[PDB]
Amino acid sequence: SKPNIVLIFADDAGFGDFGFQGSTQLKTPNLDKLAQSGVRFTQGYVSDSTCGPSRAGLMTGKYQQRFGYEEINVPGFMSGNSALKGADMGLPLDQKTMGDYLKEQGYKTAVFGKWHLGDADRFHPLKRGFDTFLGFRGGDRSYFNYSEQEMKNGNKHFFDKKLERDFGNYEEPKEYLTDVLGKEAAKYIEQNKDEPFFIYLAFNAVHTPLESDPKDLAKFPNLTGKRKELAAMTLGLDRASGYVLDKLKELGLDDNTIVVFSNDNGGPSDKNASNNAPLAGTKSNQLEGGIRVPFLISWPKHIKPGSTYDYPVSTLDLLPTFYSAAKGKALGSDIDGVDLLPYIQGENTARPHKVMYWKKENRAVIRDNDWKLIRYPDRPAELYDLSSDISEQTDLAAKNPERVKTMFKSLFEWELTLERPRWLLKRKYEKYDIDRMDKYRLPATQP
Amino acid sequence: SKPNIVLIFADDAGFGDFGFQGSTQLKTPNLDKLAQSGVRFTQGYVSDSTCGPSRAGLMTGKYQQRFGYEEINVPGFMSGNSALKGADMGLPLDQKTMGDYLKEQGYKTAVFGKWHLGDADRFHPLKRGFDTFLGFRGGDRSYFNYSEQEMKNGNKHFFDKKLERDFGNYEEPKEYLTDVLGKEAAKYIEQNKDEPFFIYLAFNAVHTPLESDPKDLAKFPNLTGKRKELAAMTLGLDRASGYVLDKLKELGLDDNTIVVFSNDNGGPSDKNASNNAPLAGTKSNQLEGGIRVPFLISWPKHIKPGSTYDYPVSTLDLLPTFYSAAKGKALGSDIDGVDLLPYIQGENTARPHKVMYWKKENRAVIRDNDWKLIRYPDRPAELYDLSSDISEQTDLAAKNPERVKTMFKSLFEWELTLERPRWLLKRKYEKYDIDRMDKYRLPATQP
Ligand SMILES: [Ca+2]
Ligand SMILES: [Ca+2]
């Protein structure tokens, strides 16, 4: 008998904007119970500090750069010189997804909400190892229904923002999208209570646009502007998550169900007032604030409740971890993630990752234990000791020239194993990413 | 009366492998007379340290990266993810060439030898402002005829290596290609002795493959291996250059003819035994050895014979210099080169370039006066003072942190004005370029 798997994946959430992450202002009671029921990771990372490359890594358990998925796939934002534009941008078809791996172990598979791994029919979830789908192909959309007007008077790329059941059944949500996503995950759990199931629950929460239940806004009278709306949407994500967690309890599935909460990248603090405290930086930079994310795994009877795990882990680990728990035997050799279960349980006391990497064009990172080397296009490479400087305020490059040179060589060694990107952003977005990094260069504070 | 213009452009030649450049072993008597007849530049640069991007800059007078021509166009060597492959790689059609500009001033225009700005019919010289053509579309070819056998049993991209008159008149040279190229330039000068003419003479010499007249090899008994063959081919380039210079004398055109000798990039010392003394580095790195080239301009009666010009100049300058000398009035505003004539003659005492840039992906350079900042993917950015360290052995980065930061920002500012590349090399060539850089990291000496 094989465990059910629920991967709850938030969008553009603050590292510091959950109760279990030390938030005073924000309220995440259901996710607080999820944290206390299992293991909270203090050093959980995504594979990129933007939506698309992150999800590509999560879905494959592979450094997404190794198959050209380097820069974010945003239809209408790519260079006129870009190899693939619009709907042709997607997860290469030769890649085997989390869905595909769990379908081979006889799981019923579903994805609710944000896909963002290609808009063209061939990149559709139901072609990528998911039996079931309710969400949108694109990167973002309204948390309420679109009018007939707005849908008819939309540009060529607006079809990816429209809510979709399975293959091309376009119907708009009747209700706040976050609540619709939660409640459809719950229906799907009840409809599949007898077989093993895998649910990728990809909330568009708390990505822009800033849109909330009026019910949620009244609960934060003290808060103001974009922060008031983040809190409302967060409470929303927490309620919708609650629907799923309660249903598992209600049906006695919680005993033999893995539940993972995480986040696709660090918070874009200037767009959605997210707060990455106590980390520097945001979405689309490779400071801890961009790449370090809230990360929970709950598995009752298997993981001790109320435990922390302090060693670095990656979203990349989730494919092999899930597959191993689903008693999987035929794991591809091209997989960069490790099975986390032996490490969580104490059977392996080693770090699950000595060396970790990030790369978007000239911006790249190598972490070797607790050394962080950051390469930029516009300034000397910086070196940080994360064992004593979680906030990256003390550049140790100057006083460690030989460690910088070695780490620079190891980072280059890893770049040589990557494909060239399959698509390129317009040049000017590199400037926006770096100006934002500089705007949020200091540690964020709670609150 | 408008002056004739002859641009003699060698391939993969050594910075140190000409008599007028201080060569011990090699013989370039015709080019030695060319140097003495005009101005030798001690700091002449190409716009990239490889064939294709270099030629793209030369032909447009523009930083070739500003229209996506960043990495070398070699059919069969591009990433499977590359936006354009094979014959579709070429100088974008929206770009106006040196040929186009001089055809508008009523010049008869011709190109002999290596084109390498696109193999497809639309990228052909006769579409890009040349009335006449005898050469090959591709990057390299044998210095002797190809058999019917070799031509029939060649890969899809071999058609670019075949010798071509005007538009698709394929006939193989009956004689050493360097001698055939020189003698056809001379025929064309005689055939057009009465009207103003422009000849781009792009010798494939001294690019691989290493192939010489047996007559030339016997003149270098003391030399051995690849060096013996370089010397023979060099003597060959010098004789073939001689045919052109003698013909101008013979017809009394020398009085009113501008002659430029230069080189498309620094010498690939490990492939053709070229020697970039006294510079560090080679082809495909951005040390002085890659980007700094022999550079002569002769205009009898107009430029003082036997003169040196010590301030940096670029191949980029040749389009506006040529155009201005052809009494051109309607120069595009997108042009990065300056007219060198006022600077050569002393009318402008200012540097013709304060700030110069190079970029191939993560490898980039900014020069500000005699400060050279070099960015690499695999090591800390280096700073050199070229006024006192022509050989780049004394890294001043650590002792000049503020200059490094500012220059890093100016270099980024210039990257933001560029398009993304229109095509990408396979990943593994970045490793080969950097291993070669390291093999030739020390100053080359005469040997
Ligand atoms: Ca996101
Ligand atoms: Ca060349």
Numbering used by the authors:
A (entry chain A), B (entry chain B): 27 to 473
Per the authors:
The polysaccharides in red algae (Rhodophyta) are primarily mixed galactan agars such as agarose and carrageenan. Carrageenans are high molecular weight polymers having a linear backbone of repeating D-galactopyranose units (G) linked together by alternating α-1,3 and β-1,4 linkages. Furthermore, transcriptomics revealed upregulation of the CarPUL during growth on ι-carrageenan, while biochemical analysis of eight CarPUL-encoded enzymes revealed carrageenan-specific activity, thus associating the CarPUL with the ability of these pseudoalteromonads to liberate energy from carrageenan. Detailed analysis of the enzyme activities encoded by the CarPUL, combined with interpretation of growth phenotypes, have allowed us to propose a refined and detailed model of κ- and ι-carrageenan processing by some Pseudoalteromonas species.
S1_19B (locus tag EU509_08890) is a putative S1 sulfatase falling into subfamily 19 of the sulfatase classification. The potential sulfatase activity of recombinant S1_19B was screened against κ-neocarrabiose (κ-NC2), κ-NC4, ι-neocarrabiose (ι-NC2) and ι-NC4 by thin layer chromatography (TLC), revealing activity on κ-NC2 and κ-NC4; however, S1_19B did not appear to have any activity on ι-NC2 or ι-NC4. Overall, the data support assignment of S1_19B as an exo-G4S κ-carrageenan sulfatase that is specific for the non-reducing end of κ-carrageenan oligosaccharides.
